[PDB]
Design a protein around this ligand. Structure first.
Ligand SMILES: Nc1ncnc2c1ncn2[C@@H]1O[C@H](CSCC[C@H](N)C(=O)O)[C@@H](O)[C@H]1O
Ligand SMILES: [K+]
Ligand SMILES: [K+]
Ligand SMILES: [K+]
Ligand SMILES: [K+]
Ligand SMILES: [K+]
Ligand SMILES: [K+]
Ligand SMILES: [K+]
Ligand SMILES: [K+]
Ligand SMILES: [K+]
Ligand SMILES: [K+]
Ligand SMILES: [Mg+2]
Ligand SMILES: [Mg+2]
Ligand SMILES: [Mg+2]
Ligand SMILES: [Mg+2]
Ligand SMILES: [Mg+2]
Ligand SMILES: [Mg+2]
Ligand SMILES: [Mg+2]
Ligand SMILES: [Mg+2]
Ligand SMILES: [Mg+2]
Ligand SMILES: [Mg+2]
Ligand SMILES: [Mg+2]
Ligand SMILES: [Mg+2]
Ligand SMILES: [Mg+2]
Ligand SMILES: [Mg+2]
Ligand SMILES: [Mg+2]
Ligand SMILES: [Mg+2]
Ligand SMILES: [Mg+2]
Ligand SMILES: [Mg+2]
Ligand SMILES: [Mg+2]
Ligand SMILES: [Mg+2]
Ligand SMILES: [Mg+2]
Ligand SMILES: [Mg+2]
Ligand SMILES: [Mg+2]
Ligand SMILES: [Mg+2]
Ligand SMILES: [Mg+2]
Ligand SMILES: [Mg+2]
Ligand SMILES: [Mg+2]
Ligand SMILES: [Mg+2]
Ligand SMILES: [Mg+2]
Lengths: 307, 53
RNA sequence: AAACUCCAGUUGACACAAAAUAGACUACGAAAGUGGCUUUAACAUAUCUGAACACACAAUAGCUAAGACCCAAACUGGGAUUAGAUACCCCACUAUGCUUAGCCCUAAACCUCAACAGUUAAAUCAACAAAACUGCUCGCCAGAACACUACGAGCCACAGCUUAAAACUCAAAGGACCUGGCGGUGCUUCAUAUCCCUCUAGAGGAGCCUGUUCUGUAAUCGAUAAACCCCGAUCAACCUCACCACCUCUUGCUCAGCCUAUAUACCGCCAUCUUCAGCAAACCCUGAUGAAGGCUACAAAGUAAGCGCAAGUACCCACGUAAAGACGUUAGGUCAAGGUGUAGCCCAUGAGGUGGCAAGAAAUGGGCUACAUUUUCUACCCCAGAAAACUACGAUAGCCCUUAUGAAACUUAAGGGUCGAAGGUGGAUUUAGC
């Protein structure tokens, strides 16, 4: 089981109260969405996700609360249009909870292709076939040249040896198609000597697979999470009420950079800033909680109020 | 400044990310359309035959 | 009015903290240290040397106990920064820095110069530092690393200090200097179409033309940062042709042949700095005759043939533009101009014939034509008349026809008809011009 990351902080931070309407741009499993519908029984909430499986969960969970939760499906960019069809263009949303990253269910189910440890089709796509033409990670690795493929790993994955892990993929694809997660992991791990398979260690000084970050890179480029994160934050601001508390959760510093600067009005690469950081601190969950849920160790919560 | 006359007084987010996500997305889609060291001697030790000649 | 306020300014009171200026002085003490004022006590030795351990000392940090606490400040917390920042930056605060009494006994504790005595004549002297040496004595050293380590022993020290090896391993380790390279290296002057700004027209967006890349194909090759990319080609329908498939020939157009490998064996011809001014034979002198160095014009060791620059010549001048431009740099480009060293093929890696390849899912370089009113069309070659937004501007593109060349043309070029698209002057960035 996966406990919602920093659920206690996010609930206190948004202080859901009667007469307030809230939005959730990443319903996913719904642990955070349900923790918010428990504190305030009179709350009004809107949900959204890129995964139709995640949107079905919300629809099934809508039975628990008929109207307090409203389920929606679509990307961050398509969220404004989807919500504009409802007609809440001003929105006056008291808070927008923009949780980020991959869902626990998405990466716990091997079929979805997100887990390198297990054996599933190399999808790595949050989309659940809602757009059957959306390229999957397998297509990205088999099509892009070394120079192009390196860029994805170098930036999205923070891959220092971008040229090395990219050449191996180009050679492997020519011999046979790259269609499975374990196949990709072996291809990336072959770039380095056999010792290097688990030499790299996590931020907690815990050994991890050498290709762990490589999968993150392909995950971000298949789902264009970074570009969709900029539009999602911008759309939230337009639909966010004045004096309304926004709360994001940047699992990695990479996406945190966009959240870090957007709230501070700093150039992603003068007019007055329009945000109030009630909870400036960007801190991981309690160390006691990190061990229980290591997946969320790097969760950096950036809260702000619209000005 | 005092003498001067002031008159009557009153486009892709891909670049921000750092990679051209759109062009690459097209490139993969286009592919999908078709789918469906050596030793160096010390200079001082270089051998010569001038004396032997 | 009123009381409250961490807070700030003036004034006054105020310490168990630290001691501007003098101090540009170079004193005192065994060293460590010692720089506010006064006072008391007081700075061993009428040969010299003499200890890891004896005797007595010994910065800072640190320990034990009791006090002080202004300010500073490990740690710690908070705020930034960062891919990360348990750093550098900001704020707060503690051990600690102070006093007392005990410990601890370490420093790049370094003038990196042992004490004492003597000399300035010899050779002045590896180098650098700090001129070179003599006598005498104690301490110490004997390749690097292991190793301020292990064990033993001693110690108020107990994560400590002192003394201090071995095994395995290596052919070096190391000192001083010189050159080159490099410096998120200093200073000063700089670049003239020039590094930035400034000036003009452009590229980067659109279509097309063309090159390359990638992909594709049974189907060349070379160039490919500046210094590749309308480049070898002042040029590929056959031929050209070196490529692919098939068939054929074997002393073969040649006293054979090979566009087979190697441009990292070369000649040949060039790119590049060069939009440079230097290269250097032969001598001479300096440094002890070391690697190295060689200039002062009121001149102090340089002289130099030669090459380049320059001069001269070409074009319309003595201007300008061409041309020229050494040595060397990039084992730069070319074995596919030709030739050629080495290696390889010789019924085949050679020769001939027939047909065929050279496309675009795309990306990108250069260019062309445009987006119009300083324009569009016609007359004219500058005193005109019309056009001027979905019948405008705009294709040199697509489609259809004709013509030219040729044996061969959906294919190449020219012309006509049809068609009338993107494009509405183009982000970062970027080219050229005195
Ligand atoms: N651009 C995007 N638009 C919408 N949903 C997105 C998205 N990028 C990611 N998501 C989804 O947002 C979720 C983030 S991870 C899961 C968080 C969720 N609150 C939970 O219940 O755990 C995933 O379901 C993911 O598929
Ligand atoms: K003083
Ligand atoms: K002794
Ligand atoms: K010293
Ligand atoms: K030097
Ligand atoms: K342009
Ligand atoms: K040559
Ligand atoms: K040749
Ligand atoms: K040859
Ligand atoms: K042949
Ligand atoms: K162009
Ligand atoms: Mg004595
Ligand atoms: Mg002694
Ligand atoms: Mg000692
Ligand atoms: Mg002491
Ligand atoms: Mg003390
Ligand atoms: Mg204190
Ligand atoms: Mg203080
Ligand atoms: Mg000292
Ligand atoms: Mg002595
Ligand atoms: Mg030794
Ligand atoms: Mg020591
Ligand atoms: Mg010891
Ligand atoms: Mg011992
Ligand atoms: Mg263009
Ligand atoms: Mg080619
Ligand atoms: Mg080549
Ligand atoms: Mg070559
Ligand atoms: Mg080159
Ligand atoms: Mg031909
Ligand atoms: Mg041949
Ligand atoms: Mg060469
Ligand atoms: Mg002249
Ligand atoms: Mg010239
Ligand atoms: Mg000349
Ligand atoms: Mg070469
Ligand atoms: Mg032929
Ligand atoms: Mg036409
Ligand atoms: Mg004819
Ligand atoms: Mg027209």
């Amino acid at each position: 089981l996966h406990i919602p990351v920093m659920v206690d902080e996010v609930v206190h931070c948004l202080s859901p109260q009667k007469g307030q309407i809230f939005l959730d741009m990443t319903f996913g499993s719904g642990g955070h969405t349900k923790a918010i519908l428990q504190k305030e029984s009179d709350i009004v909430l809107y949900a959204l996700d890129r995964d139709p499986t995640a949107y079905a969960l919300a629809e099934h969970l809508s039975e628990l609360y008929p109207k307090q939760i409203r389920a929606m499906l679509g990307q961050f960019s398509q969220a404004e249009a989807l919500l504009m069809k409802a007609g809440v263009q001003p929105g006056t949303f008291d808070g927008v909870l923009m949780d980020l990253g991959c869902s626990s269910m998405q990466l716990d189910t091997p079929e979805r292709g997100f887990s390198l440890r297990k054996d599933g089709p190399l999808d790595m796509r949050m989309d659940g076939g809602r757009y059957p033409d959306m390229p999957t990670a397998a297509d990205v690795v088999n099509a892009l040249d070394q120079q192009a493929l390196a860029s994805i790993l170098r930036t999205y994955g923070e891959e220092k040896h971008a040229k090395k892990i990219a050449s191996a993929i180009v050679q492997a694809r020519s011999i046979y198609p790259i269609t499975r997660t374990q196949q990709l992991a072996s291809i990336v791990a072959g770039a380095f000597p056999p010792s290097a398979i688990y030499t790299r260690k996590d931020l907690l000084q815990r050994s991890t697979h050498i290709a762990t970050k490589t999968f993150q890179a392909l995950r971000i480029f298949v789902n264009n999470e970074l570009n969709e994160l900029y539009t999602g934050l911008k759309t939230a601001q337009k639909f966010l009420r004045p004096g309304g508390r926004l709360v994001a959760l940047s699992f990695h510093s990479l996406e945190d950079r966009i959240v870090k600067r957007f709230l501070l009005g700093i150039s992603m690469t003068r007019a007055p800033l329009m945000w109030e950081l009630i909870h400036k601190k960007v801190l991981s969950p309690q160390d006691q909680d990190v061990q229980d849920n290591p997946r969320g160790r790097s969760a950096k919560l950036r809260a702000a109020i619209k000005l | 400044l005092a003498v001067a006359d002031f008159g009557p007084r009153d486009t892709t987010s891909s670049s921000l990310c750092g990679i051209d996500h759109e062009a690459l997305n097209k490139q993969i889609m286009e592919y999908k359309r078709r789918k469906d060291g050596r030793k160096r001697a010390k200079p001082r030790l270089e051998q010569d035959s001038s004396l032997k000649s």
